[PDB]
Amino acid sequence: SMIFKPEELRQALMPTLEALYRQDPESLPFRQPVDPQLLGIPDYFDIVKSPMDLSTIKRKLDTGQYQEPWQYVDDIWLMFNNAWLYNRKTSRVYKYCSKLSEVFEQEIDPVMQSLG
Numbered sequence: 001s002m003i004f005k006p007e008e009l010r011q012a013l014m015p016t017l018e019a020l021y022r023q024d025p026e027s028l029p030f031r032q033p034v035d036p037q038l039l040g041i042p043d044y045f046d047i048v049k050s051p052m053d054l055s056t057i058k059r060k061l062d063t064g065q066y067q068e069p070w071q072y073v074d075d076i077w078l079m080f081n082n083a084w085l086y087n088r089k090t091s092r093v094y095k096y097c098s099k100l101s102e103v104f105e106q107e108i109d110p111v112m113q114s115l116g
């Protein structure tokens with residue numbers, strides 16, 4: 001119920017978002033919505049029911065669609081859990097995801113503390 005100003009959400013969370021984008025090659029599979037046809041994985045939507053990626057998250061931050069920062073956390077973990085569900089433990093994407101998730105856990109905590 002406590003509502004955060006959309007511009008306070010941007011200044012606080014956008015550095016945490018840049019931290020994942022800057023991971024290269026690990027972030028590349030995550031920067032745009034998964035396109036099953038274009039990638040040749042047409043079973044993707046039979047398995048992933050709520051897709052999510054960095055461009056959608058950033059667009060929500062840019063346009064003030066999050067009311068409080070834990071919705072941002074939600075979308076980021078949903079993005080990770082989607083990739084861990086779909087790709088096999090031995091795939092590059094799966095390990096790319098784990099890297100991104102290590103980057104996120106190491107930097108989100110002081111940011112969420114400052115937001116109160």
Ligand SMILES: Cc1cc(N2CCOCC2)cc2[nH]c(-c3c(NC[C@@H](O)c4cccc(Cl)c4)cc[nH]c3=O)nc12
Pocket residue numbers: 073074077078081084098101105108109112
């Ligand atoms: C740390 C961690 C490790 C792993 N492992 C790596 C992959 O394979 C083996 C397991 C999976 C995780 N799943 C989630 C998770 C969420 N975390 C909140 C946490 O960030 C958090 C909690 C309180 C305050 C803050 Cl500031 C931040 C939230 C919603 N849904 C989630 O699934 N956290 C995971």
